Design a protein around this ligand. Structure first.
Ligand SMILES: [Mg+2]
Ligand SMILES: [Mg+2]
Ligand SMILES: [Mg+2]
Ligand SMILES: [Mg+2]
Ligand SMILES: [Mg+2]
Ligand SMILES: [Mg+2]
Ligand SMILES: [Mg+2]
Ligand SMILES: [Mg+2]
Ligand SMILES: [Mg+2]
Ligand SMILES: [Mg+2]
Ligand SMILES: [Mg+2]
Ligand SMILES: [Mg+2]
Ligand SMILES: [Mg+2]
Ligand SMILES: [Mg+2]
Ligand SMILES: [Mg+2]
Ligand SMILES: [Mg+2]
Ligand SMILES: [Mg+2]
Ligand SMILES: [Mg+2]
Ligand SMILES: [Mg+2]
Ligand SMILES: [Mg+2]
Ligand SMILES: [Mg+2]
Ligand SMILES: [Mg+2]
Ligand SMILES: [Mg+2]
Ligand SMILES: [Mg+2]
Ligand SMILES: [Mg+2]
Ligand SMILES: [Mg+2]
Ligand SMILES: [Mg+2]
Ligand SMILES: [Mg+2]
Ligand SMILES: [Mg+2]
Ligand SMILES: [Mg+2]
Ligand SMILES: [Mg+2]
Ligand SMILES: [Mg+2]
Ligand SMILES: [Mg+2]
Ligand SMILES: [Mg+2]
Ligand SMILES: [Mg+2]
Ligand SMILES: [Mg+2]
Ligand SMILES: [Mg+2]
Ligand SMILES: [Mg+2]
Ligand SMILES: [Mg+2]
Ligand SMILES: [Mg+2]
Ligand SMILES: [Mg+2]
Ligand SMILES: [Mg+2]
Ligand SMILES: [Mg+2]
Ligand SMILES: [Mg+2]
Ligand SMILES: [Mg+2]
Ligand SMILES: [Mg+2]
Ligand SMILES: [Mg+2]
Ligand SMILES: [Mg+2]
Ligand SMILES: [Mg+2]
Ligand SMILES: [Mg+2]
Ligand SMILES: [Mg+2]
Ligand SMILES: [Mg+2]
Ligand SMILES: [Mg+2]
Ligand SMILES: [Mg+2]
Ligand SMILES: [Mg+2]
Ligand SMILES: [Mg+2]
Ligand SMILES: [Mg+2]
Ligand SMILES: [Mg+2]
Ligand SMILES: [Mg+2]
Ligand SMILES: [Mg+2]
Ligand SMILES: [Mg+2]
Ligand SMILES: [Mg+2]
Ligand SMILES: [Mg+2]
Ligand SMILES: [Mg+2]
Ligand SMILES: [Mg+2]
Ligand SMILES: [Mg+2]
Ligand SMILES: [Mg+2]
Ligand SMILES: [Mg+2]
Ligand SMILES: [Mg+2]
Ligand SMILES: [Mg+2]
Ligand SMILES: [Mg+2]
Ligand SMILES: [Mg+2]
Ligand SMILES: [Mg+2]
Ligand SMILES: [Mg+2]
Ligand SMILES: [Mg+2]
Ligand SMILES: [Mg+2]
Ligand SMILES: [Mg+2]
Ligand SMILES: [Mg+2]
Ligand SMILES: [Mg+2]
Ligand SMILES: [Mg+2]
Ligand SMILES: [Mg+2]
Ligand SMILES: [Mg+2]
Ligand SMILES: [Mg+2]
Ligand SMILES: [Mg+2]
Ligand SMILES: [Mg+2]
Ligand SMILES: [Mg+2]
Ligand SMILES: [Mg+2]
Ligand SMILES: [Mg+2]
Lengths: 103, 61, 77, 44, 94
RNA sequence: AGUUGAGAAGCUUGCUGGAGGUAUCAGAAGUGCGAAUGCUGACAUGAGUAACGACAAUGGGUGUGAAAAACACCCACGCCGAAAGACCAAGGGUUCCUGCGCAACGUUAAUCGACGCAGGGUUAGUCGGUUCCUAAGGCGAGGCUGAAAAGCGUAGUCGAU
RNA sequence: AACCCACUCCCGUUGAAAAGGUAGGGGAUGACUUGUGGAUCGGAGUGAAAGGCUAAUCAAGCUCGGAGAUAGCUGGUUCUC
RNA sequence: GGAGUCGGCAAACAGACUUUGAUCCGGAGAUCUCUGAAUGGGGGAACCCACCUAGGAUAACCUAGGUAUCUUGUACUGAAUCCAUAGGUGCAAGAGGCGAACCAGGGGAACUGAAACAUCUAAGUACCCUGAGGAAAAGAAAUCAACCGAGAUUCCCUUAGUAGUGGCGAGCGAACGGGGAUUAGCCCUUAAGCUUCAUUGAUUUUAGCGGAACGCUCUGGAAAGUGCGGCCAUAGUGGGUGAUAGCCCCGUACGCGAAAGGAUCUUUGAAGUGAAAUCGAGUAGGACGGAGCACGAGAAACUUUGUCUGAACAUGGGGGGACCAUCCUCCAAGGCUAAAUACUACUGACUGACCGAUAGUGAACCAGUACCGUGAGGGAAAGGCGAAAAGAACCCCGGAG
């Protein structure tokens, strides 16, 4: 099971956008993430005449490594590590600092 | 077609199902050749329905 | 091939040695002929390709004893 | 001028073909030798 | 033929300038057929699947084109083609 | 670039480069190249020199095009014509036709091409195969022979020219 | 004449060509020429016999192994005092 | 298991799949074209032509099964020829081909060395061929010793480059006696053992699960680096994250885990086999010609056999390196036996005073490929943007280059 999942509130640790907060919109292979509102880039595409075109300059979000973010603990307002707690019949994710489940 | 509901049928009823699926697959190839096939995913979906029916039909013994 | 049917003798190899002691490869072949043997039980003649040593064994042991051995080891005649 | 190679596909298959190698043990050794090397062609 | 071979011999109409002109001036149609199909099976399938009366079928085999690329030399699949002649007046539709 | 030793060499720095290096003393060596008509790759000289592949032969006009000695059409000259014209077989395998192209290929340029990209194109009771029959020859149940592998061969069944 | 050959001169020799070309030359119903298929091969085959030919290789083919054969013979052998 | 997915070069455009459990991983099953031992008959491999039985269609077929050869067994049958023999058909079981090495056998060189070369060497090597197994072979004294004794076979270290042998040249080369690894014997008045089924338990293997502990500050595009202070340790020199991380991620030490397959060891039952009947005769010994013994005919014992001969019967027979006598020690001509030993084409984990793209495999890259040759066969070159494609919208020259 993976510690970082889609639609999770995360905070960026290490990088140009270190300190910002957002939501995970996509999880890639090779351990990379797309987090909303961070690591913005502009892509300049030539409008070729073959089957219409796309446009001029488009601004999107570049992926960043999965070890450069952490789950945001919305009880202490800090980055937190996450573990997996004992399972009666199912796994959950808990915060290592406070042992409460991740919601 | 899910295989759970296929094993409730009979050999008499499974052959009609397989025969109908071959009719539909032929029509899907007519559309593909002429060009009026938007539902491109239906091609591989009917292939697995035919294979599924033949699997259950062999298990009838 | 050149194999006796009762003793199993086949060709073997060795050397020819001259006076100056030069060696060349040679073969030693069994002394085997074709011979018809009278089978008293079958009122028949059986023709075998046996060596002269194998004829002496038939004299000592008999033809019924030898023929049973050949059939036992699956040799055809 | 006449050259050494005068092609003929019928004479090619009857000398160097697959069924010609398989007929003798010395042609069967050729095929097993070419399989051990990994040859893509394996026959004329 | 068994009931399952009927749906597997024809692969689709073949459309081109040559095939278009034949379908009007001669009531003759061009199809793509399975490479192991015979003139007898093509005749029965067209009659059964389109409810028409075919009168003559002619077939030819087409070699696949060979295309050279960076990785080497590749070629396309061989296929089979059929010309199908119908009754004097009747139209074939899909 | 400077500087230090008798030498192999050491040291300090300007510029470039952008992530690794190894004082000292020991221990192990794939430990030091100018030559071997040495091996591999790159680049010189000859030199912008020889040559551009049958000495049948070309001259105008128009068009297209960024650009025409070579492309297309027209007028006019030449050459083959028991072929340098047609058609089968072997061999080759898409070189065939059309649209779009000119970097490389074409011993020059190219708008052209047996060149690149993409489509299209081969329709048989009578043509040629296959199917029937055999030649030379091959293989060959049983069989005979042979250290082993195997050789020859009968019934047979392959093999067109 | 076609077809098969190869006597002479010249050209060509980094060739148009690893054996040709232009002029002449011999045989041209036969011990002829030629297509397709087949048989014989490495101390072996075939040879109207030149030690010729056996895939541009022949006083013993090619290929892979013994094999890094042997070389009293040539050549080379790399920093300092 | 627990949220993304529709394989890569290799991207885009589309269509979809699903927390009612998908892609993905493991056990089991179904399907499995044509060629190939190829096996219905032929063939130029991937093609052509068939026959028989059963079922189904009415036209010019479809579906499912069978049809190679040889060996062994069994049933029917039946030539010359009277009986019965060969021979002929029908069934059952088995075999066939491939594989780098190791093993046991059959055949068997030459270059080279001897500073030439014949005996000799190279060498019973290279190579070709035939069988078997996970190992094989060999194995339970007609053995050595020396008047004291040892006690089946296999492998290692010594004796020892010694005794011998040798155109007595070049060379070849033991044994007795010791030190070890392994431990085991049982039958022909029918045994240990082995194989296959059926059951008693244990242990592994084919997937997975949990898995501790960090902050501030400076330079910087980006801290894991600076400076200060902490925490975890059966886990601290692992890989990578935007520069060098025990505490960011995946891991690591350590604990857990299997519907179902494979394997090994363990019980205790059956069946077969061991198996050759009955203690060994064309055998021991001998003559001629060869091989093997370190031993090349030499005083030449011993083993083996191509040709020819040929005993005795425990008051008998074999050996103790010509041969004789005396002593000593064994009982051939019938069998079966684990372990210690040999090898790696193949799978996994770890390691390296190994290489780092002319190196290391011929081969880091779509390599036994391109290419060369009729064929057997030979056989290359060719890695690196950046942390992230953010891979350069837009304007100008130029042939819409
Ligand atoms: Mg000799
Ligand atoms: Mg046709
Ligand atoms: Mg294809
Ligand atoms: Mg410097
Ligand atoms: Mg520097
Ligand atoms: Mg580094
Ligand atoms: Mg050091
Ligand atoms: Mg060196
Ligand atoms: Mg030098
Ligand atoms: Mg140099
Ligand atoms: Mg020098
Ligand atoms: Mg030179
Ligand atoms: Mg040099
Ligand atoms: Mg110049
Ligand atoms: Mg000059
Ligand atoms: Mg000049
Ligand atoms: Mg000139
Ligand atoms: Mg000229
Ligand atoms: Mg010229
Ligand atoms: Mg010219
Ligand atoms: Mg003009
Ligand atoms: Mg001109
Ligand atoms: Mg004229
Ligand atoms: Mg052709
Ligand atoms: Mg060609
Ligand atoms: Mg082409
Ligand atoms: Mg053309
Ligand atoms: Mg054009
Ligand atoms: Mg130009
Ligand atoms: Mg040009
Ligand atoms: Mg073209
Ligand atoms: Mg014949
Ligand atoms: Mg034969
Ligand atoms: Mg035979
Ligand atoms: Mg025939
Ligand atoms: Mg003919
Ligand atoms: Mg001619
Ligand atoms: Mg003249
Ligand atoms: Mg002439
Ligand atoms: Mg003449
Ligand atoms: Mg005359
Ligand atoms: Mg003739
Ligand atoms: Mg021959
Ligand atoms: Mg020779
Ligand atoms: Mg002479
Ligand atoms: Mg050659
Ligand atoms: Mg020649
Ligand atoms: Mg040697
Ligand atoms: Mg050498
Ligand atoms: Mg000299
Ligand atoms: Mg077959
Ligand atoms: Mg066959
Ligand atoms: Mg069969
Ligand atoms: Mg067959
Ligand atoms: Mg076998
Ligand atoms: Mg010699
Ligand atoms: Mg010598
Ligand atoms: Mg010498
Ligand atoms: Mg000499
Ligand atoms: Mg020797
Ligand atoms: Mg031998
Ligand atoms: Mg086995
Ligand atoms: Mg044994
Ligand atoms: Mg012993
Ligand atoms: Mg005693
Ligand atoms: Mg014992
Ligand atoms: Mg885990
Ligand atoms: Mg952890
Ligand atoms: Mg590390
Ligand atoms: Mg860096
Ligand atoms: Mg780390
Ligand atoms: Mg940190
Ligand atoms: Mg005995
Ligand atoms: Mg006896
Ligand atoms: Mg004796
Ligand atoms: Mg003797
Ligand atoms: Mg001797
Ligand atoms: Mg002597
Ligand atoms: Mg004797
Ligand atoms: Mg004796
Ligand atoms: Mg004695
Ligand atoms: Mg003595
Ligand atoms: Mg015994
Ligand atoms: Mg390994
Ligand atoms: Mg480099
Ligand atoms: Mg390399
Ligand atoms: Mg290489
Ligand atoms: Mg070739």
């Amino acid at each position: 099971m993976q510690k970082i999942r889609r639609d999770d509130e995360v905070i960026v640790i290490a990088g140009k956008d270190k300190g910002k907060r957002g939501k995970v919109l996509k999880v890639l292979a090779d351990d990379r993430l797309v987090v909303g509102g961070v690591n913005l880039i502009k892509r300049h595409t030539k409008p070729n005449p073959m089957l219409g075109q796309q446009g001029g300059i488009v601004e999107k979000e570049a992926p960043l490594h999965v070890s450069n973010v952490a789950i945001f603990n919305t009880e202490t307002s800090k980055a937190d590590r996450v573990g997996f707690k004992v399972e009666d019949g199912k796994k959950i994710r808990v915060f290592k600092s406070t042992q409460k489940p991740v919601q | 077609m899910k295989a759970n509901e296929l094993r409730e049928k009979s050999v008499e009823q499974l052959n009609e199902q397989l025969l109908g699926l071959l009719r539909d697959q032929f029509n899907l190839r007519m559309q593909k050749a002429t060009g009026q096939l938007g539902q491109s995913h239906l091609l591989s979906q009917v292939k697995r329905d035919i294979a599924r029916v033949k699997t259950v039909l062999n298990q009838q013994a | 091939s050149r194999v006796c049917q009762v003793t199993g003798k086949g060709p073997v190899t060795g050397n020819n040695i001259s006076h100056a002691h030069n060696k060349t490869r040679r073969r030693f072949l069994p002394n085997l002929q074709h011979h018809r043997f009278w089978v008293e039980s079958e009122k028949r003649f059986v023709r075998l390709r046996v060596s002269a040593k194998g004829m002496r064994i038939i004299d000592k042991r008999g033809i019924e004893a030898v023929l049973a051995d050949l059939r036992a080891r699956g040799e055809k005649f | 001028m006449k050259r050494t190679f005068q092609p003929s596909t019928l004479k090619r298959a009857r000398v160097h073909g697959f069924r010609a190698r398989m007929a003798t043990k010395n042609g069967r050794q050729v095929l097993s030798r070419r399989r051990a090397k990994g040859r893509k062609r394996l026959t004329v | 033929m068994n009931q399952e071979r009927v749906f597997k011999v024809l692969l689709g109409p073949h459309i081109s300038e040559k095939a278009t002109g034949l379908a009007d001036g001669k009531s003759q149609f061009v199809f793509k057929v399975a490479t192991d199909a015979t003139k007898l099976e093509i005749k029965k399938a067209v009659e059964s699947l389109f409810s028409v009366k075919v009168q003559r079928v002619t077939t030819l085999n087409v070699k696949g084109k060979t295309k050279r690329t960076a990785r080497g030399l590749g070629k396309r699949n061989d296929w089979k083609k059929a010309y199908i002649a119908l009754q004097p007046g009747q139209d074939l539709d899909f």
